């Protein structure tokens, strides 16, 4: 699984403050990889936290505990 | 069914797939709201990424964001910068 | 030797943080625990590392060896009011 | 003016962490870093106070401080 670079392009351009701003094809492909890693890292850390709490499943409460550090790593 | 709502659904689908894989690999399930939470979190992250990239490019007198801009995004983590760097040289051929 | 240098610096920071926090303490009619002021002190020393590393990379990103004001402004981009404050103090020069 | 960081001190903290020994910080950047370091310390302390005031505490303890640390780090 992975993000379509088209989608990633639309996400980024949605937030640029200057309309003249563009992103090279290679940078786009990289961002596609970066977004994937971000999601997977959030999920893996969610699981590790759920296992620590002896949870049945990764619930929002467990996810919320790993968010603060994740954001600081990215 | 607006434009951003279609964007959010799109990432939510990909996040779902990504989480499915992590779930089967680790025999731990994700609640629906967790996957949705990660999805919204991911949408919000694109905002930070986009603005940093723009400012980094601008810092270098450029209007076209390049791979050095992207690698700056990953500078916080040694493994991350290593992961993203190799990947960069991989697509440079 | 190395620890000596680092420890001397960390101590200097602890002192100044104490002085800083004390000002806030009487201005706001509040008081800090020694552990609180110590925690803020270690925090500040850790933040210096990130500031330094970012500054260096931001400069190199602009093909420079000397860190400048624009570099320091990048450090403060993550907050609108922080950036306003730093940008103002920057123009003040 | 009151309390503040020493330009010398700030400089040695930065050079403590630089990866390349060709890296030099300009005077203005150093003057600004002195100011940046100050607002950081001030923000933490001030946010700690607001937190303890939210709890009706008498002093700022590490407990309240820790509650403002995450957001503080995301702003800086």
Best of C37, C51, C75 to substitute, by most chain D Cβ atoms within 10 angstroms, is C51
Residues 6+ apart with CB under 8 A from D7: D30, D31, D34
CB–CB of D76 and C82 under 8 A? yes
The C-alpha of B77 sits at a distance from chain C's nearest C-alpha, in angstroms, of 12
C-alpha R_g of chain B: 16
Residues A27 and A38 in one domain: no
Residues A14 and A41 in one domain: no
Closest CA to A42 of C11, D6, B37: B37
What CATH number does residue D13 fall under?
1.20.5.4980
What CATH number does residue A72 fall under?
6.10.130.30
Residues D58 and D72 in one domain: yes
Closest CA to A3 of D63, C87, C53, B16: B16
3-state secondary structure of A20: coil
Residues A37 and A65 in one domain: yes
3-state secondary structure of C79: coil
- The residue segments making up the domain with residue A65 are 33-74
Best of D11, D20, D24, D44 to substitute, by most chain C Cβ atoms within 10 angstroms, is D44
Residues D49 and D25 in one domain: no
CB–CB of B64 and A24 under 8 A? yes
Q: Phi-psi bin for C82: left (phi > 0), alpha (psi -120 to 50), beta?
A: alpha
Residues 6+ apart with CB under 8 A from D17: C48, C49, C52, C53
> Which stretches of D1-76 are DSSP H helices?
7-15, 27-54, 62-75
Residues D45 and D29 in one domain: no
Q: Return the axis-axis angle of helices B32-59 and A5-13, rounded to nearest 10°.
A: 70
Residues A21 and A38 in one domain: no
Q: Phi-psi bin for C29: left (phi > 0), alpha (psi -120 to 50), beta?
A: left
Residues D27 and D48 in one domain: no
Residues D47 and D70 in one domain: yes
Estimate the share of chain C in helix, then strand, then coil, as percent rounded to the nearest 5.
75, 5, 20
Note the residue count of chain D: 76
Q: Answer whether D40's CB lies under 8 Å from C13's CB.
A: no
Angstrom CA distances, B11 to A28, A44, B42, stand at 16, 18, 8
Which residue of chain A has the CA closest to B13? A3
B11 vs A41: CA distance, rounded Å: 16
Q: Answer whether C86's CB lies under 8 Å from C70's CB.
A: no
Closest CA to A27 of B63, B44, B40, B6: B63
Look up tokens 């009011």; give the residue.
C81
The dihedrals phi and psi of D5, each to the nearest 5 degrees, come to -85, 150
DSSP conformation letters of B32-73: HHHHHHHHHHHHHHHHHHHHHHHHHHHHTT-SEE-HHHHHHH
Residues 6+ apart with CB under 8 A from D24: C65, C66, C67
| Angle CA B48–B34–B16, to nearest 5 | 80
Method by which the coordinates were obtained: X-ray
Domains and CATH numbers, chain C: 1-93 (1.10.20.10)
The C-alpha of D24 sits at a distance from chain C's nearest C-alpha, in angstroms, of 5
Residues D47 and D63 in one domain: yes
Residues D43 and D70 in one domain: yes
Look up tokens 């600004």; give the residue.
D32
C74 vs C68: CA distance, rounded Å: 10
Domain count within chain D: 2
Angstrom CA distances, C39 to A32, C32, D3, D19, D72, stand at 39, 11, 19, 26, 14
Residues A37 and A67 in one domain: yes
């Amino acid at each position: 699984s992975g993000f379509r670079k088209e989608l990633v392009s639309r996400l980024l351009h949605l937030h640029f403050k200057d309309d003249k701003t563009k992103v090279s094809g290679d940078a786009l492909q990289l961002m596609v990889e970066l977004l994937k890693v971000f999601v997977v890292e959030a999920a893996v850390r969610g699981v590790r936290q759920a296992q620590a709490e002896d949870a049945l499943r990764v619930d929002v409460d467990q996810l919320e505990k790993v968010l603060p550090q994740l954001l600081l790593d990215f | 069914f607006s434009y951003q709502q279609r964007l959010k659904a799109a990432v939510h689908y990909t996040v779902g797939c990504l989480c499915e894989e992590v779930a089967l690999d680790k025999e731990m399930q994700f609640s629906k709201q967790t996957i949705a939470a990660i999805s919204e979190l991911t949408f919000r992250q694109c905002e930070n990424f986009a603005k940093d990239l723009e400012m980094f490019a601008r810092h270098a007198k450029r209007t076209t964001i390049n791979t050095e801009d992207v690698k700056l995004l990953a500078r916080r983590s040694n493994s991350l910068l290593k992961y993203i760097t190799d990947k960069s040289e991989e697509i440079a051929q």
